[PDB]
């Protein structure tokens, strides 16, 4: 190291270095002119006296704002910091009708839609106390969620008017956030201080549960597997924060599930709030560009160091539209669509943005090369014949736009890895979540693709009638015999079964293809017969 360092500083030898050790020059070039200042603070960041001095120098600047705080402001802030748990006594007193006795004796542990924590809530109610009862359970779910302002903000991406919850709750949520928005009126900008760095510990499972499952070395949790890491760093270039960031002031040891250590720089124009408990609240809708991704060592344990610089969200927003145009123009020629179509429009407002956009350039490449060309064109033609567009997002499906409107029932909300809306003919792919079954993201697409393709095949048989390939007596029966010869998920019903069968018959691993051949021979010739219609 020292040798390389020496050659770079001495003006006359710099060129010699670049000729014989290109890589060495590159490393040292970026090292001595941005990363070295980042390195200085962490050394001082070890001395408790320096940390205390930094915290104090920050206090006086926010003294006037703090001294002018009212009771309503402090009370509101208190709720944001602590998650609010729902009270049972309130919900029980809110029903009062016949449904509770009916509910009394129901096979609780038989609903896949419910999650573990929600079953426990139901079990506590049960201690107190294939039909029409699981639909009543759907309504109850939209009422047992905890009151969590911060949680609502990422699911909705900042679009506060989302009709995904009860109107009264909706009114309650809108008022609290707007009031908080007024509270953060003081900008950080001052003549008293330059570059300030703050830290925040975050769990990798919050960004991508697909990578988080194999990120940590299977044997020794203190080491990180280099192979998966290389994929993660590849396209992580920028991010946007729409919700309320809770940041620390001095680095502190992190909990077990937090393997990301963020280093965020601020701009004098960023609006922000000071907290007496050594934390800062940043304004919502902030954009961040990622400058570097590296592995660091701390207290015998491995971590991921991530820096970031706050910039106006609009500057990042410009990147998303230009990205939108590049991908749509490329596939219109490869498919044969009209020059100006809005097909792959994607709207993302979260922390892992940059990977979602680049991952589009991969799901479709695997999508085309693996499916018979004439099927794509014919089905794409069908899709354009209506207003449907592909939509890649990083917010929960019930909050995008299209899904809520057409279903119309409040309780008709559904969130999952993928979804297909026949009425709107659109394919939705939520990147951030991880399929409890699927192995990768491509398979998630093909599954949703199966649901869409099935609709056109049914459309070609008869134009007036809207129906699927199933419900025709020549297929319902077929599901009763071989329906249980594959994965248990497809056994759920006919619709998922067709979609389930479709990916496997077109999987990239020929072995899987052979399996479906020798386990459901009848279906195999049947599927080849609907696709013939071209």
């Amino acid at each position: 190291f020292a040798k390389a360092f020496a050659y770079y500083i001495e003006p006359q030898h710099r060129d010699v270095l670049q000729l014989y050790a290109p890589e060495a020059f590159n490393y040292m070039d970026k090292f001595n002119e941005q990363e070295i200042n980042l390195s200085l603070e962490e050394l001082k960041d070890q001395r408790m006296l320096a940390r205390y001095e930094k915290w104090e120098k920050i206090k006086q600047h926010y003294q006037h704002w703090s001294d002018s705080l009212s009771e309503e402001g402090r009370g509101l802030l208190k709720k944001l910091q602590i998650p609010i748990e729902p009270k049972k006594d309130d919900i029980i007193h809110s029903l009062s009708q016949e449904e509770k006795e009916l509910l009394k004796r129901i096979q609780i542990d038989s609903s896949d839609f419910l999650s573990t924590e929600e079953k426990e809530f139901l079990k506590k109610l049960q201690i107190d106390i294939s039909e029409k009862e699981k639909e009543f359970l759907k309504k109850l779910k939209l009422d047992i969620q905890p009151y969590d302002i911060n949680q609502r903000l990422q699911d909705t991406g900042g679009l506060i008017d989302s009709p995904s919850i009860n109107l009264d709750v909706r009114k309650q949520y809108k008022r609290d956030i707007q009031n908080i928005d007024a509270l953060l009126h003081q900008s950080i900008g001052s003549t008293l201080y330059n570059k300030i760095y703050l830290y925040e510990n975050m769990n990798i499972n919050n960004l991508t549960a697909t990578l988080g499952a194999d990120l940590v070395d299977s044997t020794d949790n203190t080491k990180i597997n280099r192979g998966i890491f290389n994929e993660f760093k590849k396209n992580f270039k920028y991010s946007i924060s729409s919700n309320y960031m809770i940041v620390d002031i001095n680095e502190r040891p992190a909990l077990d599930n937090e393997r990301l250590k963020w280093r965020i720089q601020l701009s004098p124009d960023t609006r922000a709030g000071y907290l007496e408990n050594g934390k800062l609240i940043l304004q919502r809708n902030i954009g961040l560009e990622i400058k570097d991704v590296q592995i660091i060592k701390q207290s015998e344990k491995e971590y991921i160091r991530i820096d970031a610089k706050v910039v106006p969200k609009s500057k990042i927003d410009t990147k998303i539209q230009e990205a939108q145009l590049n991908i749509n123009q490329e596939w219109n020629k490869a498919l044969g669509l009209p020059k100006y179509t809005k097909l792959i429009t994607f709207n993302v407002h979260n922390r892992y943005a940059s990977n979602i956009v680049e991952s589009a350039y991969l799901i479709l490449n695997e999508w085309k090369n693996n499916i018979q060309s004439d099927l794509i064109k014919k089905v794409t033609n069908y899709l354009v014949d209506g207003n449907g567009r592909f939509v890649f997002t990083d917010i929960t499906l019930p909050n995008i736009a299209e899904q809520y409107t057409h279903q119309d029932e409040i309780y008709e909300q559904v969130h999952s890895k993928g979804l297909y809306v026949p009425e709107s003919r659109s394919i939705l792919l939520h990147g951030p979540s991880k399929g409890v079954e699927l192995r990768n993201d491509s398979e998630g697409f093909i599954h949703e693709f199966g649901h869409a393709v099935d609709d056109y095949a049914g459309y070609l048989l008869d134009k007036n009638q809207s129906d699927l390939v199933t419900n025709s007596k020549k297929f319902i029966d077929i599901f009763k015999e071989e329906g249980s010869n594959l994965t248990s998920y497809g056994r759920t019903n006919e619709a998922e079964f067709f979609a389930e069968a479709f990916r496997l018959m077109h999987s990239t691993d020929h072995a899987e293809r052979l399996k479906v051949q020798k386990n459901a021979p009848k279906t195999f010739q049947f599927i080849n017969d609907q696709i013939k219609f071209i």
Binding site: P11, Q12, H13, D15, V16, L19, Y20
Partner: protein, 529 residues
């Protein structure tokens, strides 16, 4: 930003003072500061130079141009190094003459470039005409050519120019005057006009060995017989059989390299007659006869204490000079030239130079210069002469003889012997200091019969096409094989060195090989033959 370069010669200051080298990276060449470990394995030379001289040597090529190769591709390789002046050195070589009266003596000649002693910067050569009798009956030149007391002879020779320097000449060709005796100038060879459109690259001839040599007499109408020569003069020539060829330094223009497009054009503004004075007054001169016993002269740039600008040149110690100018190297850290250790050579110095070196040798407390060789400083203007220690030398520093003992080992390898002659294999350098051989026959009782018993009948040794020397007995015999009066009679062969040769009949016109210093060279009996 400055990366200062005061001398404005491409290389920055620090590089020139400390050491640099150019090294090719796949296809692109760049200049780099000397790194000890990565360049030594690559066989690169460590250059040094002056940060205040556009051309450290002071010759017309910049410090940068020389090492980079952007230069007239004819400059000899060893002169690419920034501290060796590149300039031309032209002398004249006369191949053969012919004589008659205003019965034609047509003899072949051999010439060697000379240097004598306080020796000065002016080129001269020296021809020596062979005395051996090509014709048996051509005893006494005065009569083979009808020369009378009131007659005049005409001289008609062939010459070629040889460039033994380090740079090419282009347009001009030097004026050169023939001189017999001490000061009798017979003729001045005209400077032909607009005729030397060809080039004299170092170590080349003009015209090349494949073309007729330039006839000295014009053969035109310029002068009917420019080289007249009175009787008394002819006599002087007969006793000395030697001439001198003095040549001046009026060369042509200079070939320069143009950076914009890489064209080498002969510029009519720069002329060697303006440069040579600079070189000759700011460099140390080293003369060496190592290669083939011919005087090769090189000049190295040394510091001159009295002059500010001159203290900038890198200190040059004698040891490195031999290394970079001639090819000396260090197989085992001991200086040697192709095997022959440095200790087999003499060091002679001009009186000025001698004094300076005696001082330098005192503050170091050493007596043998061969040890402290790497500690001897060169100042401007020393002149040094390094000659092989084993050979005898004459006044004009030409190789002329050797110790008899050395001569014998060169013959201890008899490849074959018969009654028709020897086909020997001698080291190419010795057979240029042997004038001839004396053949004799010895009676079984100690008598001695010498076959070629005439001063002018020694040239019996030819050279075969495979470099094997072959001695022919039948040449100056009676075209008869070799007879032996007794298979027990010893056959002795003798060699005669130059210094000990006779060039004219003696006082009483003796032709016998009596008073000739003869070295024993061979002695096999009849049975061995």
């Amino acid at each position: 930003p400055t990366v200062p370069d005061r001398d404005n010669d491409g290389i920055p200051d620090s590089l020139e003072v400390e050491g640099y080298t150019v090294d090719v990276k796949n296809k692109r060449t760049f200049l780099s500061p000397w790194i000890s470990n990565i360049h030594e394995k690559k066989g690169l030379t460590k250059y040094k130079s002056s940060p205040e001289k556009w051309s450290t040597a002071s010759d017309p090529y910049s410090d940068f141009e020389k090492v980079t190769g952007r230069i007239d591709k004819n400059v000899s390789p060893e002169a690419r190094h920034p501290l060796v002046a590149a300039y031309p050195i032209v002398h004249v070589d006369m191949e053969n003459i012919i004589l008659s009266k205003n019965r034609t003596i047509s003899k072949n000649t051999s010439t060697s470039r000379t240097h004598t002693s306080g020796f000065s910067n002016s080129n001269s050569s020296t021809v020596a005409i062979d005395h051996s009798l090509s014709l048996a009956g051509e005893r006494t030149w005065a009569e083979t050519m009808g020369l009378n007391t009131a007659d005049t002879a005409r001289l008609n020779a062939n010459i070629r120019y040889v460039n033994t320097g380090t740079a090419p000449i282009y347009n001009v060709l030097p004026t050169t005057s023939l001189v017999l005796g001490k000061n009798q100038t017979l003729a001045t060879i005209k400077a032909k006009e607009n005729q030397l459109s060809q080039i004299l690259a170092p170590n080349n001839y003009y015209p090349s060995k494949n073309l007729a040599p330039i006839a000295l007499n014009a053969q035109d109408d310029f002068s009917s017989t420019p080289i007249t020569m009175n009787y008394n003069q002819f006599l002087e020539l007969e006793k000395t059989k030697q001439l001198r060829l003095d040549t001046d330094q009026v060369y042509g223009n200079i070939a320069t390299y143009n950076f914009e497009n890489g064209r080498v054009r002969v510029d009519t503004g720069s002329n060697w007659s303006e440069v040579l004075p600079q070189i000759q007054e700011t460099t140390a001169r080293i003369i060496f006869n190592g290669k083939d016993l011919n005087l090769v002269e090189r000049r190295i740039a040394a510091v001159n204490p009295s002059d500010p600008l001159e203290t900038t040149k890198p200190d040059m110690t004698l040891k490195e000079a031999l290394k970079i100018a001639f090819g000396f190297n260090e197989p085992n850290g001991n200086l040697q030239y192709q095997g022959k250790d440095i200790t087999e050579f003499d060091f002679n110095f001009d009186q000025q130079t001698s004094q300076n070196i005696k001082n330098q040798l005192a503050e170091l407390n050493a007596t043998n210069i061969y040890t402290v060789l790497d500690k001897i400083k060169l100042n401007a203007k020393m002149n040094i002469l390094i000659r092989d220690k084993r050979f005898h030398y004459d006044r004009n520093n030409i190789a002329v003889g050797a110790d008899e003992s050395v001569v014998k080992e060169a013959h201890r390898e008899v490849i074959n012997s018969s009654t028709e002659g020897l086909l020997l294999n001698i080291d190419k350098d010795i057979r240029k200091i042997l004038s001839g051989y004396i053949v004799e026959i010895e009676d079984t009782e100690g008598l001695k019969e010498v076959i070629n018993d005439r001063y002018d009948m020694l040239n019996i040794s030819s050279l075969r096409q495979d470099g094997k020397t072959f001695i022919d007995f039948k040449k100056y015999n009676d075209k008869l094989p070799l007879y032996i009066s007794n298979p027990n009679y010893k056959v002795n062969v003798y060699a005669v060195t130059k210094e000990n040769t006779i060039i004219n009949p003696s006082e009483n016109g003796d032709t016998s090989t009596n008073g000739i210093k003869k070295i024993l060279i061979f002695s096999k009996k009849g049975y061995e033959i």
